Prior knowledge:
By secondary structure, chain A is of the alpha+beta class.
Amino acid sequence: DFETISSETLHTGAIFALRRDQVRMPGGGIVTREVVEHFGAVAIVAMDDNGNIPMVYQYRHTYGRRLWELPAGLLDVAGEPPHLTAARELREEVGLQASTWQVLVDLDTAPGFSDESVRVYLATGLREVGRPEAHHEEADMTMGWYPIAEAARRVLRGEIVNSIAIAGVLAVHAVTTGFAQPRPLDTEWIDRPTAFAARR
Amino acid sequence: DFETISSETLHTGAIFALRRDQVRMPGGGIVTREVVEHFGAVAIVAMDDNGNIPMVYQYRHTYGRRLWELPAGLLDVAGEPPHLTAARELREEVGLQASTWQVLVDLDTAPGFSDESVRVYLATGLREVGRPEAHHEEADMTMGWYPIAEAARRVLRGEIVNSIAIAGVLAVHAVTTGFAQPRPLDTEWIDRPTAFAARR
Ligand SMILES: [Mn+2]
Ligand SMILES: [Mn+2]
Ligand SMILES: [Mn+2]
Ligand SMILES: [Mn+2]
Ligand SMILES: [Mn+2]
Ligand SMILES: [Mn+2]
């Protein structure tokens, strides 16, 4: 079922495209299904030798306020491998470098209307290296180190609400409590976006 | 900082509006900040007397496949209280009724480009009641009961990727392991969307 009958691009912006598709429903009808094409992104849970991780306080215009989040960046560099996008962004945002990288959790942010998918890595064996000069939203953001457990409590207390940070924080929390294990970098990323990047 | 200089509506669809704002950055510059206005939504982690919860397998056109998710619905009923939207949708989607309702976790799905926020409730004291005749995506979706721990393992294994389901599953998992506690229904929902609903 669910066959796409027609695709019409309604808008192409800086980081996503708006597309309206006509989809055939179970009953036999046809409906509007609008999708927001997104580059996709990556985030990093950089855990240090004592179980602490870095988070950034970044202003989000969508909410008109700053949220506590994990270091993260868009896959807006055509051809750049995701784990490189991760390492690059970790260094730029929290000035860190890691000797070990594994896959923590992948999340599909808003399945209802966007194809954006985000891969969260767990970076260990941390090294403090230089951080570049930031621009825009990043020139305003700050950071703080949190024990994974407190970070986990912050989520359950509503102090952390960014879906990417929630997933990574609770996922690493499950790992540090011995409930689960990290995963190989070559783990399949089923829903990694391709549409918007494919546009150009 | 970050003052909105101008707002232009680019598109109004069935469930969200696309708006392009001009925002003043730290350096003194002005940039395009496109926001997707969304009704907002609610989800339910209905836990039974033995630690099991219901999940639905629903087709998501954005990804062209079915995902395992929590029962959930849009706040598309002007005036309907969120916890009522929750109870209504729980019954309609997994044919359940609960005598107890608390707040589990709130998540801001895609902070980068949308104001959508989702409140996940934890429903207990379950009762099996009738389920209506479904339409569209819902007429195709099925469901299955999962022990919270297995559901948690499914997340860490990439078998559950919907951000709402990840948050609720790992959040309730933290509660069942005695790490955290549920919260009162009157808990403040900081980022509950208002823009799109306010349009009409
Ligand atoms: Mn970033
Ligand atoms: Mn970037
Ligand atoms: Mn960045
Ligand atoms: Mn639903
Ligand atoms: Mn509904
Ligand atoms: Mn529904």
